[PDB]
Amino acid sequence: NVNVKKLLESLNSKSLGDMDKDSELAATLQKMINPSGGDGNCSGCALHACMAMLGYGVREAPVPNEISEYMTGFFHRHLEQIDSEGIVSHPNETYSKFRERIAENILQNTSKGSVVMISIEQATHWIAGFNDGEKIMFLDVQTGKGFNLYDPVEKSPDAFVDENSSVQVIHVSDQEFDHYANSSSWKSKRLC
């Protein structure tokens, strides 16, 4: 069984920048959580990244025909916040700087060990955020990437963010994560 804390230990012993660290962990998790390499609307991927970083275990995300088990109605308590303005990019802001500003917001509003679901442009796409106590790791385990805004092409840290790009940081409660962990749906997902 995959041990996330071991992954983090190894990773943090590396002479790699923060974004490359996020990319490495996300690519490792992608092979486990999204083995089929589906590119649909796997908000289940981001949720499963959150479950993993919380220590619930690494499980395969639901495939499209499993969305109706649970994910179909997962965000029903958060629809207002999801559709809100959120954190809006500045003109000529680099990907790295926008990422850094979003991380500052999450660090300010979560404690060490916490995770958040990150809505991109009002649920156009989802990524996960993990507070390790000093920094935020951004994980896109669907695609095996770190922080990104779901542009159809890869973006280096120094690329400019398109005007009016936004994210909404969704504070899924412990109750909501633990309800998932106790569900038949979660339990029927392949462990590892």
mmCIF file of C-alpha atoms in Angstrom, residues 15 19 33 37 46-47 57 62 67 69 76 97 118 138-139 141 147 151 154 162-163:
data_model
loop_
_atom_site.group_PDB
_atom_site.id
_atom_site.type_symbol
_atom_site.label_atom_id
_atom_site.label_comp_id
_atom_site.label_asym_id
_atom_site.label_seq_id
_atom_site.Cartn_x
_atom_site.Cartn_y
_atom_site.Cartn_z
ATOM 1 C CA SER A 15 17.213 19.894 -5.012
ATOM 2 C CA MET A 19 6.647 23.656 -8.800
ATOM 3 C CA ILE A 33 -5.543 7.630 -9.103
ATOM 4 C CA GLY A 37 -5.569 8.545 -18.282
ATOM 5 C CA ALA A 46 -9.001 16.182 -7.247
ATOM 6 C CA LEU A 47 -11.139 14.785 -4.427
ATOM 7 C CA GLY A 57 -5.265 6.149 1.430
ATOM 8 C CA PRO A 62 -14.414 7.015 -9.967
ATOM 9 C CA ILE A 67 -19.854 9.413 -10.980
ATOM 10 C CA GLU A 69 -22.546 6.827 -7.012
ATOM 11 C CA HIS A 76 -24.087 20.631 -3.135
ATOM 12 C CA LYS A 97 3.295 34.752 -9.145
ATOM 13 C CA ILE A 118 -9.549 24.406 -5.953
ATOM 14 C CA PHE A 138 -0.927 22.158 -5.958
ATOM 15 C CA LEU A 139 -1.839 18.780 -7.472
ATOM 16 C CA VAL A 141 -3.633 14.198 -10.485
ATOM 17 C CA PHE A 147 -0.459 24.135 -10.562
ATOM 18 C CA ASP A 151 -5.108 25.807 -20.620
ATOM 19 C CA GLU A 154 1.550 23.535 -20.915
ATOM 20 C CA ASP A 162 -4.703 35.283 -19.295
ATOM 21 C CA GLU A 163 -6.539 38.366 -18.085
#
